Amino acid sequence: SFSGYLKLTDNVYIKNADIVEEAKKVKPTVVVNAANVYLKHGGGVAGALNKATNNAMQVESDDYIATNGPLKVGGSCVLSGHNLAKHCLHVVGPNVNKGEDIQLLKSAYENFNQHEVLLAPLLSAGIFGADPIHSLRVCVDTVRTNVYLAVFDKNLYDKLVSSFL
Ligand SMILES: O=C(O)Cn1cc(Br)cn1
Numbered sequence: 001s002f003s004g005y006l007k008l009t010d011n012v013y014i015k016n017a018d019i020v021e022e023a024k025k026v027k028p029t030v031v032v033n034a035a036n037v038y039l040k041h042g043g044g045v046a047g048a049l050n051k052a053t054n055n056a057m058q059v060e061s062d063d064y065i066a067t068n069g070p071l072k073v074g075g076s077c078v079l080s081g082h083n084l085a086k087h088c089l090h091v092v093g094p095n096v097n098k099g100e101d102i103q104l105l106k107s108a109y110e111n112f113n114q115h116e117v118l119l120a121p122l123l124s125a126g127i128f129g130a131d132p133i134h135s136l137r138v139c140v141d142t143v144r145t146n147v148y149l150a151v152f153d154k155n156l157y158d159k160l161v162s163s164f165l
Pocket residue numbers: 121122125126127150151152153154156157
């Protein structure tokens with residue numbers, strides 16, 4: 001069970017935490033990965049979660065891509081959570097650094113509604129280049145299931161809490 005989270009709404013919770021460390025502690029049913037369409041877990045949250053699985057997430061993801069092809073921006077797939085969670089929900093938020101449509105962020109968060117409870121990062125934040133304040137707004141206005149957000153950066157966490165409407 002999740003501890004130390006600030007409650008933002010009926011169903012959205014937030015904590016300044018490293019999502020890999022949080023996943024190892026909680027062992028949630030679902031950990032969300034900040035995936036790209038190719039499931040190439042190189043950096044940000046994806047690189048960190050993959051390294052914590054000793055690259056097993058990448059090996060499983062390469063088999064998934066070989067069979068199914070790439071995901072869509074805004075889409076997701078459920079794969080194993082390995083040593084971190086029961087499942088990993090790989091969600092592709094739009095990457096502003098690839099010129100992707102920020103309007104797809106709501107579609108990306110809709111994937112969370114297929115899971116009653118999730119440990120997640122803010123979609124499209126960090127190396128995906130979107131405004132994290134707007135990502136949190138889309139999260140609370142889209143996700144209806146119980147989402148526990150892990151914000152890696154303390155300054156960003158404090159700014160997200162202090163500016164939350
Ligand atoms: O804090 C987050 O979860 C997203 N992020 C912002 C920076 Br700076 C580094 N990562």
